[PDB]
Amino acid sequence: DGSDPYEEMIPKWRQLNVFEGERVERGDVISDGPEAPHDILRLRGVHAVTRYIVNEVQDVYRLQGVKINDKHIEVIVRQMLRKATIVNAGSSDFLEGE
């Protein structure tokens, strides 16, 4: 990637999907499987984890025949998106959840 390579280890129990280069961008899927919500936040952004959780939650409700507005899930998602982690110093903060 030009600089700072990302050394990742796969225990070989899961097949590696992308064989060639194809200029794999950030957030691309390396191997198939249900992704954790934490991974989407770190690489794809806040907006992506909001869209994933809303669709996943609303899929169960819509299947039963229940109508709930999407504003009521985004409000709860906002309450789970506090407590950032700091990777820089100079303002009385160093590697601590605040």
Place this chain on the structure above:
Amino acid sequence: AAESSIQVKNKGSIKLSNVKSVVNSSGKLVITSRNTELKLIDEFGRTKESYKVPYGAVLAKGDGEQVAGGETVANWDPHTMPVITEVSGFVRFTDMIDGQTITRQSSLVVLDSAERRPALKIVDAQGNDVAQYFLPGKAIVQLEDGVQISSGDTLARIPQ
């Protein structure tokens, strides 16, 4: 759903997005991109169908064509993703061992990682050098050396 055919409910023109155009052995094209998007445009900008297209797929009708509906727009093997050939010509096999990396079923296995994957480019006409070929576990190539295979063609890969 073992059927790999994709049905079209309404006569909407297919809109293929985020795809790689690779010339195949016929007028159709093979997509080498894992992530692909399909959309239908009938009379306005609103889409109707998305579906999902895996890598190594062959589209029945070209992008932007007004599909009449009720017919397949793209066909692909639902069990294996073919590995496309970047160079058209003879297949160059390197370090081909008989009795250990050969499994008779010509259709012969390439190599086994546990038993032992040489990488070589496809020859131009016979043995000319022009691409890295990776052979995972249980990978089999049914095309022998000198087959003079054209670009956009792939044999059975036999996933492990």
